[PDB]
Amino acid sequence: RKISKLAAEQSLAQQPWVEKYRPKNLDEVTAQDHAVTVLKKTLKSANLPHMLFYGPPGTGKTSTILALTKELYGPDLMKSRILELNASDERGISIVREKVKNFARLTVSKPSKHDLENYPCPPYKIIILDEADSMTADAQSALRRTMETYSGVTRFCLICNYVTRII
Amino acid sequence: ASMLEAKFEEASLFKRIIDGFKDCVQLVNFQCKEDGIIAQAVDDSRVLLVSLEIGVEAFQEYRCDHPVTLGMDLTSLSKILRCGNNTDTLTLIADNTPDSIILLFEDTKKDRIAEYSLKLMDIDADFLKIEELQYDSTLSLPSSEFSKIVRDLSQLSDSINIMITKETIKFVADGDIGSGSVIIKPFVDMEHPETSIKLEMDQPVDLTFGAKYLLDIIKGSSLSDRVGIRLSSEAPALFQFDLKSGFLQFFLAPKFND
Amino acid sequence: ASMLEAKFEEASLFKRIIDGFKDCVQLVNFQCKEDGIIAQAVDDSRVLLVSLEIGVEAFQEYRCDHPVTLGMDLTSLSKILRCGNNTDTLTLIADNTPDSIILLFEDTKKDRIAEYSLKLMDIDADFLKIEELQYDSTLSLPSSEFSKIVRDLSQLSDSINIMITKETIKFVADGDIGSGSVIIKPFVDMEHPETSIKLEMDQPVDLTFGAKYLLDIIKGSSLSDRVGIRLSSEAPALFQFDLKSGFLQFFLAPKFN
Amino acid sequence: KRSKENLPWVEKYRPETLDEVYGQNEVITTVRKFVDEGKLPHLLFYGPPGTGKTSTIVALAREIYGKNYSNMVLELNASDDRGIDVVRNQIKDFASTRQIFSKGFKLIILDEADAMTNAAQNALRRVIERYTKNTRFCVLANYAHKLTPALLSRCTRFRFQPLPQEAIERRIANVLVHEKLKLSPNAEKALIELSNGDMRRVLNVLQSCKATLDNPDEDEISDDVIYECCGAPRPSDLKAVLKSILEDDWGTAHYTLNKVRSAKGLALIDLIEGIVKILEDYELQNEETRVHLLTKLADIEYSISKGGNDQIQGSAVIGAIKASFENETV
Amino acid sequence: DNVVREEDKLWTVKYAPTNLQQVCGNKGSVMKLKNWLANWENSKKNSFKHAGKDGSGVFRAAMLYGPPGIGKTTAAHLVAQELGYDILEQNASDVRSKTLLNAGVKNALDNMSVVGYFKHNLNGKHFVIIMDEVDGMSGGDRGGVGQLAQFCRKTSTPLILICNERNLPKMRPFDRVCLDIQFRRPDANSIKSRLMTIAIREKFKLDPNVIDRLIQTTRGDIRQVINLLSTISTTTKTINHENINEISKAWEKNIALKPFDIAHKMLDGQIYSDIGSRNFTLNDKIALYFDDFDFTPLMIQENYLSTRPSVLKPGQSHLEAVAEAANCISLGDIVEKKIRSSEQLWSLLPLHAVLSSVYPASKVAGHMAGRINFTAWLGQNSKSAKYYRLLQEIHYHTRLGTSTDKIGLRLDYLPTFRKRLLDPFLKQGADAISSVIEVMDDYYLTKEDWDSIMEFFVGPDVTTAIIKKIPATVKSGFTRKYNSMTHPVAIYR
Amino acid sequence: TLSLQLPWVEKYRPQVLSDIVGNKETIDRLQQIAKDGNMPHMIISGMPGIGKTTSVHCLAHELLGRSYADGVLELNASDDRGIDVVRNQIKHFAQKKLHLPPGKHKIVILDEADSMTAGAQQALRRTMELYSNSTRFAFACNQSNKIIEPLQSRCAILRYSKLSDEDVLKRLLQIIKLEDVKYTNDGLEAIIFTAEGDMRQAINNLQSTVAGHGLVNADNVFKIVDSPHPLIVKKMLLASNLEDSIQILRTDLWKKGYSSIDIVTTSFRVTKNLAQVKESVRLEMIKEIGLTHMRILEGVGTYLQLASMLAKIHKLNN
DNA sequence: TTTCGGGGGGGCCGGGGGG
DNA sequence: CCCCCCGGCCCCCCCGGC
Numbered sequence A: 001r002k003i004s005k006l007a008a009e010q011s012l013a014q015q016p017w018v019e020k021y022r023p024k025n026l027d028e029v030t031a032q033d034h035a036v037t038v039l040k041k042t043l044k045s046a047n048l049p050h051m052l053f054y055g056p057p058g059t060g061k062t063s064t065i066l067a068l069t070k071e072l073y074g075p076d077l078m079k080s081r082i083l084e085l086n087a088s089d090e091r092g093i094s095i096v097r098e099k100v101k102n103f104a105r106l107t108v109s110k111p112s113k114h115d116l117e118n119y120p121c122p123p124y125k126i127i128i129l130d131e132a133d134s135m136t137a138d139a140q141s142a143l144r145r146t147m148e149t150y151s152g153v154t155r156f157c158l159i160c161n162y163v164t165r166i167i
Numbered sequence B: 001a002s003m004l005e006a007k008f009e010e011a012s013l014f015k016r017i018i019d020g021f022k023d024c025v026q027l028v029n030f031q032c033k034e035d036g037i038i039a040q041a042v043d044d045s046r047v048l049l050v051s052l053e054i055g056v057e058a059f060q061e062y063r064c065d066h067p068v069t070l071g072m073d074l075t076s077l078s079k080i081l082r083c084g085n086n087t088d089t090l091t092l093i094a095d096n097t098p099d100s101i102i103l104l105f106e107d108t109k110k111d112r113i114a115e116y117s118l119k120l121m122d123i124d125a126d127f128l129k130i131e132e133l134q135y136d137s138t139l140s141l142p143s144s145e146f147s148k149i150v151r152d153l154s155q156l157s158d159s160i161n162i163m164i165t166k167e168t169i170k171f172v173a174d175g176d177i178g179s180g181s182v183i184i185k186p187f188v189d190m191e192h193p194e195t196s197i198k199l200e201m202d203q204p205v206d207l208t209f210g211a212k213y214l215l216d217i218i219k220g221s222s223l224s225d226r227v228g229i230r231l232s233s234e235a236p237a238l239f240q241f242d243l244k245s246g247f248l249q250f251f252l253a254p255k256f257n258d
Numbered sequence C: 001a002s003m004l005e006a007k008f009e010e011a012s013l014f015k016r017i018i019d020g021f022k023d024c025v026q027l028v029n030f031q032c033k034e035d036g037i038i039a040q041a042v043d044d045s046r047v048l049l050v051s052l053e054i055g056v057e058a059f060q061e062y063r064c065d066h067p068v069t070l071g072m073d074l075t076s077l078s079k080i081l082r083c084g085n086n087t088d089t090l091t092l093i094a095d096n097t098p099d100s101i102i103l104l105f106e107d108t109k110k111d112r113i114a115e116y117s118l119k120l121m122d123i124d125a126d127f128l129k130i131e132e133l134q135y136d137s138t139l140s141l142p143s144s145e146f147s148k149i150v151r152d153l154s155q156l157s158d159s160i161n162i163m164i165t166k167e168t169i170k171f172v173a174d175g176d177i178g179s180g181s182v183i184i185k186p187f188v189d190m191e192h193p194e195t196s197i198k199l200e201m202d203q204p205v206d207l208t209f210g211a212k213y214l215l216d217i218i219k220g221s222s223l224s225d226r227v228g229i230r231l232s233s234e235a236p237a238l239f240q241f242d243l244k245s246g247f248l249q250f251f252l253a254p255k256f257n
Numbered sequence D: 001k002r003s004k005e006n007l008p009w010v011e012k013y014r015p016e017t018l019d020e021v022y023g024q025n026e027v028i029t030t031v032r033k034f035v036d037e038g039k040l041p042h043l044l045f046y047g048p049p050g051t052g053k054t055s056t057i058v059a060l061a062r063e064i065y066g067k068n069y070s071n072m073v074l075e076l077n078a079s080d081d082r083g084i085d086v087v088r089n090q091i092k093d094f095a096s097t098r099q100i101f102s103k104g105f106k107l108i109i110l111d112e113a114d115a116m117t118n119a120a121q122n123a124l125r126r127v128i129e130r131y132t133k134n135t136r137f138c139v140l141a142n143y144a145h146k147l148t149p150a151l152l153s154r155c156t157r158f159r160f161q162p163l164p165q166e167a168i169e170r171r172i173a174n175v176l177v178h179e180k181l182k183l184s185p186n187a188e189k190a191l192i193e194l195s196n197g198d199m200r201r202v203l204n205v206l207q208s209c210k211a212t213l214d215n216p217d218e219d220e221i222s223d224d225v226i227y228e229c230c231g232a233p234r235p236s237d238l239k240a241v242l243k244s245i246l247e248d249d250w251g252t253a254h255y256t257l258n259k260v261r262s263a264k265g266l267a268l269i270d271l272i273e274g275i276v277k278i279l280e281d282y283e284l285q286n287e288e289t290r291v292h293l294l295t296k297l298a299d300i301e302y303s304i305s306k307g308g309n310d311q312i313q314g315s316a317v318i319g320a321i322k323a324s325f326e327n328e329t330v
Numbered sequence E: 001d002n003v004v005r006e007e008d009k010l011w012t013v014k015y016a017p018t019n020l021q022q023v024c025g026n027k028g029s030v031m032k033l034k035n036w037l038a039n040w041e042n043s044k045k046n047s048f049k050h051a052g053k054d055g056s057g058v059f060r061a062a063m064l065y066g067p068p069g070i071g072k073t074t075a076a077h078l079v080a081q082e083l084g085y086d087i088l089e090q091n092a093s094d095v096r097s098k099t100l101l102n103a104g105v106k107n108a109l110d111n112m113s114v115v116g117y118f119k120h121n122l123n124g125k126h127f128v129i130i131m132d133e134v135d136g137m138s139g140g141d142r143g144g145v146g147q148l149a150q151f152c153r154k155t156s157t158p159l160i161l162i163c164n165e166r167n168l169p170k171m172r173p174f175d176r177v178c179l180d181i182q183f184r185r186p187d188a189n190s191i192k193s194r195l196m197t198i199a200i201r202e203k204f205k206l207d208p209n210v211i212d213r214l215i216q217t218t219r220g221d222i223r224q225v226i227n228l229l230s231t232i233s234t235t236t237k238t239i240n241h242e243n244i245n246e247i248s249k250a251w252e253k254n255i256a257l258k259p260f261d262i263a264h265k266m267l268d269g270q271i272y273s274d275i276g277s278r279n280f281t282l283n284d285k286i287a288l289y290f291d292d293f294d295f296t297p298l299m300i301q302e303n304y305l306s307t308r309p310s311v312l313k314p315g316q317s318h319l320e321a322v323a324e325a326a327n328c329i330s331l332g333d334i335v336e337k338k339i340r341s342s343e344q345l346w347s348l349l350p351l352h353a354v355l356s357s358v359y360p361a362s363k364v365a366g367h368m369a370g371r372i373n374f375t376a377w378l379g380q381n382s383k384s385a386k387y388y389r390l391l392q393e394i395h396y397h398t399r400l401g402t403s404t405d406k407i408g409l410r411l412d413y414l415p416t417f418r419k420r421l422l423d424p425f426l427k428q429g430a431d432a433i434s435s436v437i438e439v440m441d442d443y444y445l446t447k448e449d450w451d452s453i454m455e456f457f458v459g460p461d462v463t464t465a466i467i468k469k470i471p472a473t474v475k476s477g478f479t480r481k482y483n484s485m486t487h488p489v490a491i492y493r
Numbered sequence F: 001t002l003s004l005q006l007p008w009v010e011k012y013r014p015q016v017l018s019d020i021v022g023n024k025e026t027i028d029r030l031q032q033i034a035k036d037g038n039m040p041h042m043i044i045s046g047m048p049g050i051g052k053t054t055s056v057h058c059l060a061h062e063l064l065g066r067s068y069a070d071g072v073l074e075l076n077a078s079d080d081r082g083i084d085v086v087r088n089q090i091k092h093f094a095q096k097k098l099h100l101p102p103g104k105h106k107i108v109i110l111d112e113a114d115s116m117t118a119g120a121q122q123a124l125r126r127t128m129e130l131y132s133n134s135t136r137f138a139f140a141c142n143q144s145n146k147i148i149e150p151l152q153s154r155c156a157i158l159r160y161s162k163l164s165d166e167d168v169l170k171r172l173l174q175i176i177k178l179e180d181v182k183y184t185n186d187g188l189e190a191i192i193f194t195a196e197g198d199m200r201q202a203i204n205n206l207q208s209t210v211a212g213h214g215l216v217n218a219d220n221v222f223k224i225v226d227s228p229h230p231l232i233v234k235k236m237l238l239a240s241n242l243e244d245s246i247q248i249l250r251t252d253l254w255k256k257g258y259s260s261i262d263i264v265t266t267s268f269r270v271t272k273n274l275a276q277v278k279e280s281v282r283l284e285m286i287k288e289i290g291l292t293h294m295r296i297l298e299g300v301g302t303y304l305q306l307a308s309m310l311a312k313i314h315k316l317n318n
Numbered sequence G: 001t002t003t004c005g006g007g008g009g010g011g012c013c014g015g016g017g018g019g
Numbered sequence H: 001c002c003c004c005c006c007g008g009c010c011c012c013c014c015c016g017g018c
């Protein structure tokens, strides 16, 4: 048989409280103002740097990056402007040299009139490497010049629990 | 689908143009202006430069409101182009500050439409105005003859020596299993001018080129039945194939003589 | 550039001759004398012998001051020859104590000259003497038909058996996937004698040969319309293709009974 | 890519000419002399992160060739394929062929060459030797042990030092002029201290500090702003923690450590590093004290690197310091 | 035609043996090979089923093996020519993959020689297929080594294979298909006449007393000895004791040791003394480890308890040194795990060398008390893998009925299954068969699962003797009853 | 500037066997072979920059002369040298016919042969054996162990020793006279000391010092050539007081920009080669250094870890 | 034994070109 | 319309320190 699809609000209502109350915007992040203020200023400065979020479990790193991408682009343009890779993905040196580099060199997706009228829409895309501390040293080394060369259209965000794992 | 719209009466033509240099360069910036389209790309080894020009006369319809640069990967473009048939018109469509280029194959007789999209890329390569040069020697000959000579001499060696002297062109190749030398002299036929071999020498010339680059260059013989070669000691060799309203040019650097 | 000067009015003939046996023997010694060119080469497996004769009549301006021997690898020679043209005239030039041979492609209609040099090989292969032998079976059949039968039977087994009896020729191939047979009888037609299968069987014959060797041999079918097969009781089988003034022969040792 | 103002400061302030590279005066002078007299050898720039190696080589290429250097040089880095096949074909072809545009010599820049395979490095030897008449090679590295001895034998070595105080000060002054920013002397000293000779850290921290100010056109960057943005301890906090550890009883030391950390949510590792820096200057009567301090604190840092219980680690730091300093009496 | 002057040729060619008697050393092997090839025809007449006095009549292929430069190829060609066979030779310069092997020499196994027919001995028309440098082929299946082993069983003509290392894993397919002929390093006496003749012919002075040294330099390589003489005589026309040491040191053949030799050397106490360590340095010991970095640690861990140490510190018992060595070996195992991880930290290999081999050996170095043994860890690991596979199969057969993991199945369930599956046969004989089958059906167990279960128990509960003691009739009836019924399936594939 | 000055390692590359310094006996043997020909298969081994490629090329040139272009086949690590190459190109070269004087042969020079695959080496065996009447093989390598034993059996072994300071000084003086370089004895001593027996390194450093400063004295040489860090590491490990070792670590290595991984690897090597310390003490030192190396590879590369390593070494030594 | 990554070598497959 | 050449994936085996 088949079941009628549930609404997003109804689905979230019956989710575990950790997922149900995940912050939806930067104002909902609780006690990370020393960084959240800097991130919020980018909505106007439009010069977001490469980011390395690091901290112990359950402090709000993934929530913070998701909320930042939402605020920057909007629910319509986020997907086209974001490439997310985490520990559940393949992230070998070949992947870094081909897929990540190919996405980094692409022209940014075209914003619509509504997107421009309602969101900052900075002229760059975002590559999120969550759980970056699981990546090998050689794969990390393959990212060095890619980050610098295509910084005009791409910005990287690495997230980790153990900062020493990052070269 | 307004800013840039260019119509090819036959998609086969554009497919041939792309095939002429898709094996030389991989990443190309096509600059479209009100006067037409121009592309210029340097291969990875930095030894060969490809320069393509297509005028408005090559198109049934052409409208480019403002100049636009489109960065493309030639392999992907060739893959999309091989989809079209030989009886379909091909429309290239782009919008303001585009992120992609639309290729539209149309068959009015069968009322069939096929639309493909290719995402563009941020290529930070600036077109380099190739200043005109006074070449020591200028020759022209049928494309098939030059391609045959190149393919025959590439079997023997990885380097081919071209020497121009008074009314004579010699192609030499010395290798491990033997050597080969082909002599061609200027000649004109009034019954078959397309087969004429023409030479004009101000100074003698002697250059050496990599065989693989010449093998790639000769792939442009499908665009023009004749090929022109301009050679100078202090300049790169220029191989030109003439299109109806444009041209395809290969600037090849010779090997260091040492 | 005068010791040996051999001119083919057509470069296609020599290229076809080489292609006839370029897939079986790599290094070949060509002995050029005032009477023409002769070559003898043994395959790597040492069961197939290729003999080539080219008479002076086949050439246009054959000239040889004194006997010369030229050792050549057939791959390089084929690569050189593919640079020519059928209409072009092909001249072979060799000098005294030559380390290389010159191949000259000339075009009469145009003024285009193509000169190539081929480095000679140091080959120390012995020359075997093949004495005329009286075979108990001799069959002449179209080259295309022989090649077709050989190719069809090679698809089943690695070996093919040929059995010759009174006005009857049988080719069998039994392998693992299956078996196949082909039967022919002598036939002659006045209107089309070129398809006339002719058989002369002094005594019945039965032999077996390797499929790969026969596949190599049948590559000479492009040189002669007909092929002559001579078989003896316990002697190598002779497959001959006739040329304008020469021959190409393959002596194939059979498989032990 | 709408404007250079949209770039991160680490890229917006990339030097474009050799005159904009600070803190490497000896290397810059020597290489400029090499280029001026046409005596450029094969080069090996070795140094730690963010010292100016890539910037220097790009500026040198621009000086040699001008604005169109990009089409006149062959640049390969760790993000590109550089296997033995690439050496055999692409590098070899570039090194053996004349320039398309001009008649000058050819430059191959192997950035991050310490990531190249041993086979490719070995293949590079005869390419470097054979075509030295018309081609030059530059190799950049942070780790010299990944470079084969044969390659090092063929190169002239230049070491990029950690950036001195004066160079960082001058670049900070230039950035402040460009950005219309105000910086306090104490904040500047703290920024230099946390830089550790890496210019990228200075630029990133300064950008964050500017983002932190309510009115950057009028508010001045104080040391408080730096410590807030970086979430780092103040020197006073480190002094108080160390004094409590070395003077008070266990209850007081534990209370003081917890209070200091909770005031601004400091990380234990930062406190450990600061206290180690302070203790290096302390004069110890017994070598055993220094031995115990170093070994125990290194063990604690290694344990922290893998996570673990923060409170137990803090108590371990306190106990290690007390036990080590009990050796200064007898 | 131009010929080559003898003065232009290498001494090895200029003095190559011309008949079998000039071959120095290995006379027995040469005679054995010659007799084998001489009676190969008779062996064929008997279908290779009757073995003679030498027992070589049951082999269609001969396999000659020995160290480099001792006369393997020379002897093979000489025997082939002496008996009048036509030689078909293949070597590492040729393509001997499975495809080429089947398309090439395969057709020559039962084929006549055209050369042997046009050159006319009764064997002249028959081939002798010589496959030289068999160890020089790479690959497991596409290489064609197994294909050659298969050829060795059905060849209709003599086949001689030559290699250098007969004990390599790649040589496994040739286990017992060919007559193995071993060529050993020839001693100085078997060659002294040859070198003296070469010296007098070449007009240079050579002292006999140093010949034994020269061979020691070349490790019995006659070709290398001749090369050494040719090279040295170019400038030094007299070879005596005044210059033997320098020549030997300059030309010494440095070959990697094998695991047994590595273990013997590393565990010798002399090298760990002041003088010994100064002569054999720590770097030399690390290099010795690197001769075979995969096997050296296993050898050391296998043999470090079988020594009489001579490096014991005062007040230290053998047991304490053994304990220190074991601790270091454990640390080396940790380092090894680090090396073979996802980070591929091969740069740690030298450290491993110290922790796994050098340090424990230095702790227990001395004199070997008994024979040096090959590591038993590999076989035990394979056996454990097999038993774990069987345990997993049993567990997933019984998963539907039980509540546990495989470890719990082994530790807890298996004894009770023993009581309810094996004990009844030992008490009620055949009358229990049904019950046992019932239990099996309740847990989807098969006969193979029954045997595997019985194979797990250790200590007092070993079942082999008990199972063998069961009457054969009871087991036959059990098998009959199990095969005479329908049984369920836990996993439907 | 778009012009290049030819390096002195190439301008003054020896062209004859008499211009090569060091390994006198082997050079004389090569000279005699070139005189009388009959060159055998040879393997030349040695450390970098001592004149192996130079020796082989000079021998080939002096042996062949005008026939050099036709009778020499050179292959190195920058060329394709797979099993297919050995089976086709090298075999064709060996089989090729070439008229040479009564005592000369064709030469195949396989430079950097230690990088060749085992398959190609195996394929070379019978090619060397069958065509030795017209072709001879010269291998040049750094590690002769990589050459399979069957190939070593067929060749003549020539192990090149390291150049002494006297030969290096002689060659440097020759080049200086040819270039009219102004120098001081201390400058040449520093160049030789930093060269460590590598003639190529010595000449490169001399040329760089002349280009950058003109006068070849101690100061300019040390400004161009840095003191090798292995010696600094040895001084660090041999220090008696922990404070002295820490001071050396901080001031001479860490503040100069040397990476922690480089420091720990160099410490391991120096400790391994410290013949002045008892082997057992060296083994304990290596255990501690390996612990620190594993920690650094894990990502914790800090001055504190290296200081702790030094403290543990001093504790062991006391 | 073997947890990535690089390199090499051999086997098919299929596009294109030629006849 | 069919056969052959030759570029490209695809699979499988083997080091990995100095």
Ligand SMILES: Nc1ncnc2c1ncn2[C@@H]1O[C@H](COP(=O)(O)OP(=O)(O)OP(O)(O)=S)[C@@H](O)[C@H]1O
Residues within 6 Å of the ligand: A017, A018, A019, A021, A022, A023, A028, A029, A030, A031, A032, A055, A056, A057, A058, A059, A060, A061, A062, A063, A064, A160, A161
């Ligand atoms: N600063 C925070 N503010 C509000 N909720 C938070 C915060 N941090 C964690 N949470 C809550 O815990 C949930 C998980 O937050 P995350 O952003 O996933 O933490 P995290 O640092 O990414 O965890 P790791 O590093 O993957 S273990 C959120 O959905 C929130 O419900």
Ligand SMILES: Nc1ncnc2c1ncn2[C@@H]1O[C@H](COP(=O)(O)OP(=O)(O)OP(O)(O)=S)[C@@H](O)[C@H]1O
Residues within 6 Å of the ligand: A144, D009, D010, D011, D013, D014, D015, D020, D021, D022, D023, D024, D047, D048, D049, D050, D051, D052, D053, D054, D055, D056, D141, D142, D171, D199, D200, D203
């Ligand atoms: N000497 C310097 N002078 C001015 N800015 C510098 C200097 N060094 C680094 N920077 C700044 O930091 C940025 C990076 O400099 P780089 O030249 O890329 O350092 P790097 O040594 O190449 O880093 P690695 O070795 O790839 S981690 C530059 O764009 C500058 O903004």
Ligand SMILES: Nc1ncnc2c1ncn2[C@@H]1O[C@H](COP(=O)(O)OP(=O)(O)OP(O)(O)=S)[C@@H](O)[C@H]1O
Residues within 6 Å of the ligand: E011, E012, E013, E015, E016, E017, E022, E023, E024, E025, E067, E068, E069, E070, E071, E072, E073, E074, E075, E163, E164, E186, E194, E222, E223, E224, E226, F125, F149, F150, F153
């Ligand atoms: N027993 C021997 N007596 C005399 N000379 C020998 C002897 N063995 C080897 N040689 C000499 O060394 C040369 C080579 O001998 P080979 O028969 O090729 O030895 P090999 O065992 O086959 O070496 P490999 O396996 O190919 S490395 C001979 O031509 C002789 O000159």
Ligand SMILES: Nc1ncnc2c1ncn2[C@@H]1O[C@H](COP(=O)(O)OP(=O)(O)OP(O)(O)=S)[C@@H](O)[C@H]1O
Residues within 6 Å of the ligand: D125, D150, D153, F008, F009, F010, F012, F013, F014, F019, F020, F021, F022, F046, F047, F048, F049, F050, F051, F052, F053, F054, F055, F141, F142, F171, F199, F200, F203
């Ligand atoms: N014995 C020498 N005498 C004179 N110059 C030498 C000598 N050795 C090296 N050189 C000089 O250094 C340059 C390089 O010498 P090479 O012969 O290439 O050393 P190499 O041993 O072959 O180096 P590798 O093993 O390939 S790293 C020569 O061109 C000479 O200029």
Ligand SMILES: [Mg+2]
Residues within 6 Å of the ligand: A061, A062, A063
């Ligand atoms: Mg998270």
Ligand SMILES: [Mg+2]
Residues within 6 Å of the ligand: D053, D054, D055
């Ligand atoms: Mg850099």
Ligand SMILES: [Mg+2]
Residues within 6 Å of the ligand: E072, E073, E074, E132
């Ligand atoms: Mg042999």
Ligand SMILES: [Mg+2]
Residues within 6 Å of the ligand: F052, F053
């Ligand atoms: Mg060299």
